[PDB]
């Protein structure tokens, strides 16, 4: 049974420490291995060093705390080794990629080798956003917007003290039109919100937040989403060439992208998804009585929206 | 078996990158180079084969090789070795394009991920192309623009003929990267020799080329900066080891590159070290002899706690 991997990202907030302190110490009933930057465990049961020098600590609550070098593969493979030998037991893996950490390279690690593809299965990317400092952090650091862009789910905290932050709701939507935004106004972040996002599965509803007309404000950010709607079918060969040219032109620019396509002559939905250079497609549920259409979303920095829309517009007969 | 010399070519895209790539793939220069790029500059493709990992490898008329990459760079690197061992292709230099928004970080880490890559490939250096006309603007808007400079072992500054008095730019590049020498590329094409033989990923004793001067106000302009640490006193090898390990872990996500020469208390040999992000290594070197012993270190990164770092090394004193 594949291990469910969750990436916890977002800028330096106080809420991240509280969440990590809850996984490592309290008894929540989850079997979680954690790769973090700091030190929140106050009850270390045992400890072992893997074949690749990975420091693996077993905690009293059953959970595991794990360190990482510059090569994440080492920690991942050492966790599997000691899992197979019954040294440790865990069902979920939570990796902290907060601060200046790029979620990109971490995601790609879980697709690098065949063994990691089979033994690990990415769940989703969770972006923690502090409503008080979000705008400032995103204005100064590109990586702050990027972490939001990679997210399958955005947890917006401290809105009770940030005041009227509807403008922030919009800005997150312009950056990431895929991820729903969860706004916790009273209480803390539930641990279960990190899991079962289904973010790395083929979706038919790729766009959660419908785009609104704000020309003078929808060009502020550097990372944005491009939502493309087609009410016409396209040739599977033609659209395949367009995508391959598109994904290569903006290779370094694209964070994540998903879409549902109406293929000319095919009675089934064609779904696709991708992260940077890695992309995959597959057929799905038949159209039936539902009116056929195409819906795609491209998240990235400095995307050539004009060229992208024009390319899809030329697929019309 | 001579380890293939790998060069990373970074910097914000422009006319200096396309012309340079078009010269490597087409013109006769005498280098046996394999190129991994994003575009398609070569015109005269001689032969083409597909690797066992679906790598598209093209042999060119000028002898050079053009290669494609998926999201996993290991695939192309291992397929190049496969067809090199089988005599299908021949090259002794590898040039990887990481221009635009590309982060040099993950690419650097690829060449340390596995033992085979450590022996067959040898990271020469990171070459950063800089447009004198647009540099200040790009660096103000994009953190990645400063980062690419921060990773550089050599900075090629171009379009200085159109920019003119780009002296304020020299200083800003120096504050960002105090390791890398700056080469003002004269008008025209960037010469191919400026990309090669930097010895950037070897242990150096002269870690700082551009010794920092006093420019307090302008030294708070960037997010990525260098911290030059000078010590005129020896340190306990255990004490300094604890300080570095705490430093590297505290600023794990922040550190781009770092190098240093250390005066170890009781040891007659120089201790050199170098690192890229989380990956770091140290080793002894040339003995001191008649040369006056001292320590010189440089830390390049974003939002570095300079105060804490200097204080930590200051506490290593007796
Ligand atoms: Zn821990
Ligand atoms: Zn090419
Ligand atoms: Zn690998
Ligand atoms: Zn100068
Ligand atoms: Zn001249």
UniProtKB/Swiss-Prot annotation, chain A:
Annotated residues for binding of GTP: 10-18, 160
Motif segment (CXCC motif): 63-66
GO biological process, one term: DNA damage response
Gene Ontology MF terms in the entry: GTP binding; GTPase activity; identical protein binding; transition metal ion binding
Activity modulation notes: GTPase activity is inhibited by metal binding. Activity is decreased in the presence of Co(II) or Ni(II), and is completely inhibited in the presence of Zn(II).
List of residues binding Zn(2+) 2: 73, 113
Chain segments annotated as transmembrane: none
EC number: 3.6.5.-
Residue ranges annotated for the CobW C-terminal domain, each copy included: 223-314
Pfam family, one: CobW_C
Catalytic reaction list: GTP + H2O = GDP + phosphate + H(+)
Coiled-coil annotated residue ranges, if any: none
Keywords: Chaperone, GTP-binding, Hydrolase, Metal-binding, Nucleotide-binding, Zinc
Binding locations of Zn(2+) 4: 166, 169, 186
InterPro entries: CobW-likC_sf, CobW-like_C, CobW/HypB/UreG_nucleotide-bd, P-loop_NTPase, Zinc-reg_GTPase_activator
Binding positions (Zn(2+) 1): 36, 41, 65
EC top class named in words: hydrolase
Residues given in the record as Zn(2+) 3 binding sites: 166, 169, 186
Cited NCBIfam families: PRK11537.1
Protein task: Zinc chaperone that directly transfers zinc cofactor to target proteins, thereby activating them. Zinc is transferred from the CXCC motif in the GTPase domain to the zinc binding site in target proteins in a process requiring GTP hydrolysis.
Subunit (UniProt): Monomer in the apo form. Metal binding induces oligomerization. Forms homodimers and higher oligomers.
Protein family: Belongs to the SIMIBI class G3E GTPase family. ZNG1 subfamily.
Name the UniProt record assigns to this protein: Zinc chaperone YjiA
Organism, scientific name: Escherichia coli (strain K12)
